[PDB]
């Protein structure tokens, strides 16, 4: 019907079910609209700002907002949340200290009039707090862009009060003599956002992000997709547990990721920029509460998959893309081939598996490895016999010798090791199979 309660130019029955914006008006969603590119949106029929961002449901869905905002935030659930963090490009150092900084942005919305805050800490003790004065105020910061932009020298940082920074008493300098870098972390960032007024001009002076930070961060779940070379932070709204009046739609984790990161789902797989980010080909990291929630919710779920559980308010997810991944079907970035591998199989995770008769050993050079970094190998093993014992030997700073008991179906195993020293002993990784085993989706991922 045409009854409207929240007063956001979208009918209630259209909000509860699917709806799309056609020629600046909302129409009932029809499945035949998928081919043309029309996207189906659903949102609560009792609130205008569903995700908490300043733009309402009609403004976000109809594209009537600032053009710098990515298409990911045009979904009423994804919040236009700019994430800004100061990076320390170089250090210059009684003694006067200078630093080179360059702000980074990863959210779905730009931040105007950037004004960050920094902490000068070396070990626990913080020397001083710096609010960037009028010299370092970055006027514009588009998503996935830096201030200054690529191809420009980072701007200096000497303004503390026009007093300059200085470590005094020589005790901090004495501690630094042994070697302790001065960390630069961003406590907070102050910025504005764009709203078109009655006269049509974009006004970005009276606005402020700080009013909506405590609201966006309280009615949404953070989902981060890290590919190593770049990071993307998105927040997806979700309903409360014991609230009988919260009409925020419920979405699965996979659907939340697809909505947030604008992933092209081709049949069954999920792709971000041509790289698969589906459940079986990426290592996910959750905090303790999310891990407990998922563990509790898997038993009640028949399919028993991570990407089929509903999202909940307060969730935290990190999607760590593997550094090196192979599947024996369409991708193998490993510089060195594996040992005793047979592709003549049909019982794999998607198409084929690895038929091993004996043991598999892999040798990796140190050219493509980062010293003082932790790497984790993972894969899926299938053994219908359930009678073969498999052990793995890992050569590293600390020698590891562990055994595994594969099940009838595919099971994911995680083995953690740390490599220290670029010019160290060659890493030896060997796994032994009692009989014939099936392997698929072997991945190498760099961690903290």
Nearest to a second copy of 139, 401 (CB atom):
139
Report d(CA 197, CA 361) in Å as an integer.
65
With CB under 8 A as the contact rule, which of the stretches 204-212, 329-337, 415-423, 439-447 interacts with a second copy? 204-212
Decide if residue 88 touches a second copy (CB under 8 A): no
Pick what 243 binds: a second copy, Ca ion, none; C-beta below 5 to 8 Å, kind-dependent: a second copy
21 binds, among a second copy, Ca ion, none (CB under 5 to 8 A by kind): a second copy
- As measured in angstroms, the least distance from the Cβ of 5 to Ca ion is 6
CB neighbours (10 Å) of residue 370? 12
Window 425 to 444, contacts with Ca ion (CB under 5 A): 440
123 is in an annotated binding site: no
Which residues between 111 and 170 bind a second copy (CB under 8 A)? 112-113, 117, 119, 121, 124-131, 134-136, 138-140, 142, 147-149, 152-156, 158, 160-164, 166, 168-169
Q: How far apart are CA 36 and CA 32, in angstroms?
A: 8
Q: Return d(Cα 331, Cα 326) in angstroms, integer.
A: 6
* Rounded Cα distance, 240 and 46, in Å: 14
Query: If contact means CB under 5 to 8 A according to the sort of partner, which of Ca ion, a second copy, none does residue 100 touch?
Result: a second copy
List 214, 229, 266, 367, residue binding a second copy (CB under 8 A): 214
In three-state form (DSSP H/G/I as H, E/B as E, the rest C), the secondary structure along 92-112 is: ECCCCCEEEEEEEECCCCCCE
Listed in sequence order, the DSSP H helices in 112-252 are 171-178, 210-216
What x-and-dash track marks residues 43-72 binding a second copy by CB under 8 A? ---x-xx--x-x-x-----xx--xxx--x-
Closest approach, Cβ 406 to a second copy, in A, equals 38
Query: From the CB of residue 315, how many other CB atoms can be counted at a distance below 10 Å?
Result: 22
233 binds Ca ion (CB under 5 A): no
**C-alpha dihedral over 58, 63, 66, 71, to 10 degrees?**
120
Instruction: Closer to a second copy by CB, 28 or 408: give it.
Output: 28
Q: Does 328 bind Ca ion (CB under 5 A)?
A: yes
Q: Binds 43, which of Ca ion, a second copy, none (CB < 5 to 8 A, cut-off by type)?
A: Ca ion
Say whether 57 counts as a known binding-site residue: yes
The per-residue DSSP string of 109-137 comes to S--EEEEEEEEEEEESEEEEEEE--TTS-
Tokens of 377: 């190998």
Q: How far apart are CA 383 and CA 388, in angstroms?
A: 8
Q: Whole-number minimum distance, CB 186 to Ca ion, in Å?
A: 34
Q: Among residues 20, 43, 172, 323, which is the contact residue for Ca ion, using CB under 5 A?
A: 43
195 binds a second copy (CB under 8 A): yes
Q: Which of 4, 11, 88, 100 binds a second copy (CB under 8 A)?
A: 100
Judged by CB under 8 A, the residue of 18, 85, 104, 207 near a second copy is: 207
Give CA–CA dist 327/51, Å, rounded: 38
CB 126 to a second copy: min, Å: 5
Q: Please list every residue from 240 through 299 that binds a second copy, using CB under 8 A.
A: 240, 242-246
Give the range of 122-130, 263-271, 346-354, 373-381 binding Ca ion by CB under 5 A. Answer: 346-354
Q: Which string of DSSP letters, residue by residue, matches 38-81? A: ---B---SS-S-SSSSSS-HHHHHHT-S-TTS-GGGGSSSB---
Please tell me whether residue 53 binds Ca ion under the rule CB under 5 A. Answer: no
Distance of closest approach, residue 299 Cβ to a second copy, in angstroms: 20
Sort strands 112-123 and 183-192 into parallel, antiparallel or unpaired.
Answer: antiparallel
- Residue 383, contacted partner among a second copy, Ca ion, none, CB below 5-8 A by kind: none
Residue 351 marked as a ligand binder: yes
The DSSP H or E segment spanning 15 is: helix 12-16
Sorted by sequence, the CB contacts under 8 Å of residue 144 that are 6+ apart come out as: 105, 106, 230
Rounded Cα distance, 347 and 350, in Å: 8
Q: How many CA atoms lie within 13 A of 157 on its CB side?
A: 27
DSSP state of 445: E
**SS3 per-residue string spanning 276-325:** ECCHHHCEEEECHHHHHHHHHHHHCCCCCCHHHCECCCCCEEEEECCCEE
Interface stretch with a second copy, choices 211-219, 293-301, 418-426, 433-441 (CB under 8 A): 211-219
Using rule CB under 8 A, residue 5 touches a second copy: yes
Per CB under 5 A, does 323 bind Ca ion?
A: no
Residue ranges for the known binding site are 4, 6, 8, 10, 12, 15, 44, 47, 57, 327, 329, 350-352, 440
Binding positions for Ca ion, rule: CB under 5 A: 4, 6, 8, 10, 12, 15, 43, 45, 57, 327-329, 348, 440
């Amino acid at each position: 019907e045409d009854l409207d309660t929240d007063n956001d130019n979208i009918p209630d029955a259209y909000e509860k079910n699917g709806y799309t914006i056609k020629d600046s008006i909302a129409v009932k969603w029809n499945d035949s609209f998928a081919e043309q590119g029309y996207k189906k949106y659903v949102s609560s029929y009792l609130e205008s700002n569903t995700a908490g961002d300043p733009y309402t449901d009609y403004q976000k869905a109809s594209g009537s907002i600032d053009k710098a905002i990515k298409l990911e935030a045009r979904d009423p659930l994804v919040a236009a949340y700019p994430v800004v963090g100061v990076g320390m490009e170089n250090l210059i150092i009684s003694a006067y200290i200078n630093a080179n900084v360059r702000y980074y942005n990863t959210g779905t919305a730009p931040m105007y009039k950037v004004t960050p805050t920094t902490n000068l800490v070396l070990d626990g003790e913080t020397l001083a707090t710096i609010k960037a004065q009028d010299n370092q105020i970055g006027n514009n910061l588009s998503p996935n862009e830096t201030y200054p932009k690529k191809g420009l020298s980072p701007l200096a940082l000497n303004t503390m009060d026009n007093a300059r920074l200085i470590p005094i008493n020589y005790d901090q300098l004495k501690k630094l003599d042994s070697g302790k870098q001065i960390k630069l972390e961003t406590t907070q960032v102050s910025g504005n956002y764009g709203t078109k007024n009655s006269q049509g001009q974009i006004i970005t002076e009276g606005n402020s992000w700080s009013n909506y930070i405590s609201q966006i961060d309280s009615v949404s779940a953070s989902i981060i997709l890290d590919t190593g070379s770049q990071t993307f932070e998105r927040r997806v709204a979700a309903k409360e547990q014991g609230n009988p009046e919260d009409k925020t739609p419920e979405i699965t984790i996979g659907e939340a990721i697809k909505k947030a990161f604008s992933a092209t789902k081709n049949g069954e797989l999920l792709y971000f920029n041509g790289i698969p980010i589906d459940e079986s080909c990426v290592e996910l990291i959750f905090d303790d509460n999310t891990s407990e929630i998922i563990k509790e919710q898997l038993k009640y779920l028949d399919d028993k998959k991570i990407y089929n559980v509903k999202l909940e308010r307060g969730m935290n997810i990190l999607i760590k893309v593997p550094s090196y991944f192979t599947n024996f079907d369409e991708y193998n970035n490993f510089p060195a081939s594996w040992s005793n591998i047979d592709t003549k199989n049909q019982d794999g995770l998607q198409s084929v598996a690895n038929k091993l008769s004996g043991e598999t050993k892999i040798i990796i050079p140190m050219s493509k490895l980062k010293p003082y970094k932790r790497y984790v190998f993972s894969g899926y093993s299938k053994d219908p016999s359930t009678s073969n014992s498999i052990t793995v030997n890992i050569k590293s700073k600390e020698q590891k010798t562990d055994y595994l008991v594969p099940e009838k179906d595919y099971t994911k195993f995680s083995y953690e090791f740390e490599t220290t020293g670029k010019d160290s002993s060659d890493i030896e990784i060997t796994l032994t199979s009692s009989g014939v085993i099936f392997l698929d989706n072997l991945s190498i991922t760099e961690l903290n």
